[PDB]
Amino acid sequence: MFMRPGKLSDYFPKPYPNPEAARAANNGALPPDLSYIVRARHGGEDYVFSLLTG
Amino acid sequence: ELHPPSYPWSHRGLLSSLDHTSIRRGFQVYKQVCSSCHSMDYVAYRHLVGVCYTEDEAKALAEEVEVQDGPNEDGEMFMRPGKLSDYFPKPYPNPEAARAANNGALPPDLSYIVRARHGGEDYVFSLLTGYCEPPTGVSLREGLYFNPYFPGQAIGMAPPIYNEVLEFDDGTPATMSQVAKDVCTFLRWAAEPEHDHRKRMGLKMLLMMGLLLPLVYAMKRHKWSVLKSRKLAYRPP
Amino acid sequence: LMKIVNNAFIDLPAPSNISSWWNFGSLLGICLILQILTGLFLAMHYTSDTTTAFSSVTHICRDVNYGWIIRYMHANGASMFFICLYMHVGRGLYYGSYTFLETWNIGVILLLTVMATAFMGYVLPWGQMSFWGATVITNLLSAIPYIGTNLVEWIWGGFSVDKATLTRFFAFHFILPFIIMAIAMVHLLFLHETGSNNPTGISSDVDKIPFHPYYTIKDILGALLLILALMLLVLFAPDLLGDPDNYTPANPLNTPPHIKPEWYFLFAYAILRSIPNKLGGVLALAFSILILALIPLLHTSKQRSMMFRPLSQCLFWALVADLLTLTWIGGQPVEHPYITIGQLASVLYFLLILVLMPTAGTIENKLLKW
Amino acid sequence: LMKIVNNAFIDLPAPSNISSWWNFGSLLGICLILQILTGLFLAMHYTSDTTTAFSSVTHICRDVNYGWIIRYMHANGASMFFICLYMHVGRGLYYGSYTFLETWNIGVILLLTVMATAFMGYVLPWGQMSFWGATVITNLLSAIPYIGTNLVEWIWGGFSVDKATLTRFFAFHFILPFIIMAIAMVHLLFLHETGSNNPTGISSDVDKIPFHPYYTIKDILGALLLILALMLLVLFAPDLLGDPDNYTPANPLNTPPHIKPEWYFLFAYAILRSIPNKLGGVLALAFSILILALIPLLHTSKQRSMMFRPLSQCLFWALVADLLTLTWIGGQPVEHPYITIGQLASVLYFLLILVLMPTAGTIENKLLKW
Amino acid sequence: PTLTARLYSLLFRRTSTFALTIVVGALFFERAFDQGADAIYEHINEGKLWKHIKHKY
Amino acid sequence: RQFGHLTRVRHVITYSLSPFEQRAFPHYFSKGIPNVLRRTRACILRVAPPFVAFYLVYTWGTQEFEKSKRKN
Amino acid sequence: RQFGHLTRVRHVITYSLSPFEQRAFPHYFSKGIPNVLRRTRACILRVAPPFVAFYLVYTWGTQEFEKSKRKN
Amino acid sequence: KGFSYLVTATTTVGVAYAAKNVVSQFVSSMSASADVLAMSKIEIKLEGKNMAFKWRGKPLFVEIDQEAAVEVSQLRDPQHDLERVKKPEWVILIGVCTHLGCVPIANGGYYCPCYDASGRIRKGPAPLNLEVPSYEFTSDDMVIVG
Ligand code: HEC
Ligand code: HEC
Ligand code: HEM
Ligand code: HEM
Ligand code: HEM
Ligand code: HEM
Ligand SMILES: COc1ccc2c(O)c(C)c(-c3cncc(-c4ccc(OC(F)(F)F)cc4)c3)nc2c1
Ligand SMILES: COc1ccc2c(O)c(C)c(-c3cncc(-c4ccc(OC(F)(F)F)cc4)c3)nc2c1
């Protein structure tokens, strides 16, 4: 198996190969996926802006 | 094509089972000859328990081969000794490597090979035991060999077995035939492990159905007996 | 006060002379209810995705406690479910029950509703003959002008049989039997307005009998024998009616040598392979089934049964041979001896039904001075 | 001659005064038929395996042509399907239709048959609240002595909720509605022996009217308004009744903060969390539903309706508040103010039904010199 | 009198007693039939089953 | 059951018009409205108070719930 | 429909016994067997010949099919 | 009579035999397959730390003097430490709360938002302390749970 330039059908490239490497690379902590983060957190986008900006 | 011959297998009987002792020998064949070049994805070392190997014997073999398991907490994957839950290790990582390693040819899986080929185990024994030089006028390409028991009589399967190609544990003489017998017995267990338990229910059935059919047939001709015996007449004025 | 409806099972007037041939109507009521329970328990362990379906059957047949028996009580529970029909139909044609038009035209609609369901059901294991079966047979609609390239891609959910083709069959498959169960209760409803037929074709209002002790126990017998011939196959020859190439997973880039549907379609398939013209082959295929709806409009004898119609008996059992031929030709490959035979038999099937058998009863009337 | 059965839809005698409250019986006939079509088209793209289910919903909601509307016409097509019941039931209790015992006891059997189906249906997306919902709620049967450790593992097909737990729900889910459809036609059958009730509770044989122009168009109206309140949620607030933690895939090693079922169960759940004793909590849960089967044996007033029973009106609308409370407490966490409230409301639910409301009609009889 | 007549007078007369026979019969039948059936199968397949060879390992 | 013999009625008369010959909205606002208020006052004191009671226990329970989580 | 008024019958008599008072297998071999052969010869010439014809076209088609695949 | 009624009686016996089996076959189908039962038992494993590990699709959790210093009677569920462990430097516990099925967080013991390092409970709604499975130590490094 090799590497090629992505195409449009390809999904957004995952930065890490598996969540353990993520927990390894962030002191045991897990960066969550962000496909549904708006609709997976009470308050929605209001939460997120206040979160970064808080 | 060539219709293979039918043989007096021990398990051809409607109530005959498999020689579990032979299944033991057949696995040793797949493991030392074919497991390097054939996959069997749909079997586990646990399925061998209680049939041809026991718990400990199979468990020992689980600890012979290394298996890729476990995302490490570091975020990597490692190798460990296999366990009973683990399936038979695939020799190759993907079929292209197989086609790469066998001149474009694909060693098939062997979980269902018995029940995926017309003639069944009769075919397979005749297939291994049917190699010969081609006849005159016939010539094949490099890599491919002649065997009358194949469509086109051309396969990449070089001789897997022959006299004393391996050794058995029970002191059996490892003639090419003795080998090919046991392995086909193993594969019939792979493609049909329910075989030995199939027939026992087949036995329980015919004894019950030998009873219920006449008894029900009596209650029928008990209740209908009124009508098979009634009579009629016509008495006009 | 449901059980006024159970009078159709208890105090129902029924004739007295009817032999085993009528039991095959009830047995479908058993196979169907039997098959639904089995296929359900297969749903518990089946997966509708292509990367997991073929293995899912293995999970059943290997790791599950007696999962394997259920697969074979269910697959072959479809085969026996069509031995029952073809005899359940032949009764209706030989003993002349098709005069109950309202039922017969619904008898057809049950048949089609089924004989597409098995087609969908044969895909779900996702092997070669499953895939390639569906690949060939869907393309026949492509023969239709101006639609087929659009309709077939729609059914596939794409441009070839793939994931979404599978997943929808599983849903079209695991539903229609609950629609079939409705039409059966409908089918009976128009029958219980008229009461069943007898071998003679004569009004049996005089010698009726109840149903509770007599045909019940007869159906218990006939049901028992059915469970034999099913379980024999399950317990003594399960791969018999199968096709071993199915036990290789689907490989769309490797065509099998012999493509064919299973035995219960093959007479239809032989008719198709007979005709070279593709579209003209299709309208023969669908017409081999729908012709049943033309039977009553071709009734000519002023009698009903065929116990009292010698010439039609000889032609009827000839039709059976033509069927058995077409079952055989379809399973066998296409070469000059079998091509010729497959053509002749197919012509007989349409000829014998439309021409001779009507013509017979006309002649039979003439001998009786009618 | 089916359409003698359509006289139950055309020439049926029905009273004249009945207001909107009775339409909710028909609307279930729409929601149910509506929901079956939607959930079917979800089956075409759903996968019953754990590694593929959560994504399968995404395939629908993202890549499919209008797959997304169907998910929300179907999820919220269950929520509206329980607003309809709880009002369809409250009619039957307030206007005193429960004297049709044969229907009511079947009204219960429809309710349970449903309110387990949504539980199974809420699992299939395979998120946190799906998984953890089923993890908590199955364990309650573990409280039973000598069985529960065996029965729960059996339902799970294992020792915790996993693949085979999912796949079987999908099959228990995509079948029962076809069983529910049967019991409805049964449920009506015993109703069409007696004819429906009116707000007064009085025999309406004198002022009956047909059904074809009058209630039909009334049901067309009532159905139309239903499609509004459904599609508003689909088109203006689809995540409203949902629970956003569901949109994280299942993580059995990460418990969510707030575990709870959806809004339509919560009054049941609050009753359970009220009692500390686990098993004693369960028999209260099942009894909060089954108590409907004790209503007619607790009828005491020689009248039927509650338009003419003032004290029972005040108690009835108090019961509604107790429900609405229990709906609220169950959704909210467990702390000393809410614990106390959840206890009192649950006691009122059983107390008010069993004691006061019977006691009322007894008193009401006494004032009328009965 | 015969045995059949004695059986009827005690067992097949009352449908309550009748049914209890059938359950009782099933239990001893379930036991007896399985033992006899297995013995035949093993006798046919003697020395081929696991337990027949298990002692060696 | 069916029409025709459901019960027995005698010396009763019904008059009715054709819907094409009468308005569908007669006095819809002129007369309908006070009927609603009449239909309202006739029942509202029996529907309101438990829901009125609910709104209070909703807030009081809500505030007391908040205060419990704050501090000494 | 139901019993009672299906049709009209007059001056017809039926006699019947209790099944507990008669054998269920009377002359089962003694008389039943020739009835079968009688039931057989009455019909067999109408059932046999197309299936007889089938067995021939089965073999002849089979052999000719074989011979086609062999050689010049 | 007894002869005829014997026919149906013996028949009924053979029915109930079969009817017992096929039901028992079906119900056995819905129970745990062979695959699950393997993983349910075979659980191999290898300071001041606790890790959440999977077992039967449930969490599995894996100072001494301090924990011993905690009094037994003061627990809501009086248990001694070594009554819960087979070796003092190995706390093998099961992330399920006895109040209602929920997971506590690890690490100074546990907390559940739905205990000590040993697994015992001190304060909270939890009615019982953490449960201890049936396990064994095959070596000085390897461990087998159930
Ligand atoms: C430096 C790496 C990093 C980057 C850059 C980053 N994140 Fe985070 N994020 C994390 C980690 C690690 C967590 C885990 C938090 C925890 O476990 O409590 C997290 C948590 C979150 C959360 C909260 C999850 C919850 O349940 O509360 C959100 C939302 C989020 N990330 C999205 C974002 C957003 C928005 C941005 C800025 C546009 C962003 N990430 C950039 C690493 C990162
Ligand atoms: C040297 C590698 C090798 C070994 C060793 C080997 N095989 Fe083969 N086998 C192959 C390859 C490559 C093919 C592909 C044949 C083809 O593509 O026509 C094949 C084909 C087959 C076939 C025929 C498949 C068919 O559809 O006709 C069978 C059966 C089979 N293998 C099983 C076996 C058996 C039985 C043995 C001996 C016990 C064995 N393999 C040992 C490489 C091997
Ligand atoms: C009513 C007409 C039906 C027909 C003609 C039919 C026929 C078939 C056939 C022939 C197969 C192939 C099975 C195999 O080759 O192993 C199949 C598969 C299947 N059927 Fe049926 N079936 C019917 C009804 C049902 C019902 C009622 C259910 C469930 C309630 C069902 C569930 C399934 C499933 C899940 C499969 C795929 C699993 C498997 O094939 O192993 N089918 N069907
Ligand atoms: C799911 C499929 C079917 C079910 C459940 C079913 C069920 C039944 C049953 C129980 C009977 C009464 C027994 C009998 O008369 O034989 C019956 C009668 C009949 N069936 Fe069906 N059957 C099915 C398929 C068919 C088909 C495919 C046809 C025709 C193509 C058909 C045509 C008839 C006719 C004509 C009768 C009445 C004949 C008579 O009473 O003389 N049926 N059916
Ligand atoms: C009759 C009572 C039913 C109830 C109470 C019910 C309720 C539910 C609910 C609440 C969900 C959650 C959906 C979500 O959260 O997105 C669901 C899922 C689902 N339902 Fe329904 N349902 C019923 C009938 C049906 C029917 C008849 C079908 C199919 C014909 C069906 C197919 C599905 C499927 C496939 C899912 C999972 C797919 C998904 O949720 O995205 N359900 N059910
Ligand atoms: C799938 C679920 C249901 C369906 C399809 C259904 C269908 C119907 C329909 C169409 C009616 C006639 C309209 C009406 O009388 O309101 C009705 C009446 C009735 N329903 Fe159901 N209903 C369902 C659930 C229930 C439940 C859960 C209950 C009780 C717990 C119930 C109790 C009643 C009663 C008592 C009546 C007759 C009351 C009267 O006529 O005065 N129904 N049902
Ligand atoms: C006189 O011809 C007729 C006329 C009318 C019929 C009819 O209206 C029905 C509904 C049926 C029928 C349809 N499905 C199933 C059964 C059945 C019978 C015995 C069983 O018992 C067991 F031993 F388990 F098979 C189980 C099911 C019967 N048979 C009719 C036969
Ligand atoms: C007087 O109260 C009654 C008494 C007896 C009833 C009854 O026996 C039935 C079967 C039903 C019913 C049940 N499901 C669905 C409908 C329906 C109505 C209009 C539709 O049309 C559209 F506008 F599309 F919704 C579509 C379905 C009606 N309603 C009864 C109401």
XYZ file of N, CA and C in Angstrom, chain F residues 2 11-12 14 16 19-20 25-30 32-34 36 38 40 46-47 50 53 56 63 65 68 70-71:
87
model
N -75.792 -1.911 12.049
C -76.129 -1.095 10.898
C -77.301 -0.200 11.247
N -92.325 9.959 17.009
C -92.790 11.326 17.143
C -91.617 12.268 17.364
N -90.679 12.211 16.433
C -89.508 13.068 16.431
C -89.281 13.544 15.015
N -86.901 16.081 12.279
C -85.638 16.712 11.947
C -85.828 17.564 10.707
N -83.506 20.044 7.980
C -82.145 20.376 7.597
C -82.118 20.968 6.203
N -76.095 22.237 2.225
C -74.949 23.083 2.568
C -74.644 24.115 1.515
N -75.015 23.860 0.266
C -74.861 24.853 -0.776
C -75.813 26.015 -0.614
N -69.707 29.827 7.605
C -69.254 30.637 8.734
C -70.324 31.660 9.103
N -71.428 31.222 9.709
C -72.448 32.162 10.193
C -72.131 32.600 11.613
N -72.036 33.912 11.821
C -71.798 34.472 13.150
C -70.546 33.878 13.781
N -69.539 33.640 12.945
C -68.340 32.954 13.401
C -67.646 33.735 14.503
N -67.508 35.044 14.320
C -67.019 35.935 15.360
C -68.149 36.504 16.197
N -69.298 36.754 15.574
C -70.364 37.483 16.247
C -70.904 36.695 17.432
N -69.750 33.034 17.980
C -68.882 31.952 18.400
C -68.010 32.337 19.575
N -67.513 33.566 19.571
C -66.517 34.032 20.528
C -67.037 33.929 21.959
N -68.172 34.537 22.316
C -68.628 34.418 23.707
C -68.952 32.998 24.115
N -67.087 30.542 23.410
C -65.793 30.042 23.854
C -65.534 30.481 25.285
N -67.713 31.393 27.391
C -68.668 30.643 28.190
C -68.195 29.210 28.368
N -65.229 28.436 28.358
C -63.993 28.534 29.119
C -64.272 28.620 30.612
N -61.343 24.161 37.028
C -61.064 22.763 37.289
C -59.826 22.274 36.565
N -59.383 22.999 35.548
C -58.199 22.639 34.786
C -56.986 23.401 35.280
N -54.231 22.712 39.295
C -53.084 21.804 39.407
C -51.930 22.224 38.530
N -50.447 25.043 40.253
C -49.606 24.490 41.300
C -48.312 23.944 40.727
N -45.493 26.556 40.196
C -44.853 27.005 41.420
C -43.808 26.008 41.891
N -35.350 26.816 41.991
C -34.505 27.736 42.740
C -33.816 27.022 43.891
N -33.182 23.971 44.048
C -32.178 23.113 43.438
C -30.905 23.888 43.163
N -28.980 24.786 46.435
C -28.330 23.644 47.058
C -26.906 23.470 46.559
N -24.672 25.788 45.601
C -23.868 27.002 45.545
C -22.714 27.000 46.539
N -23.022 27.059 47.834
C -22.007 27.154 48.879
C -22.661 27.222 50.251
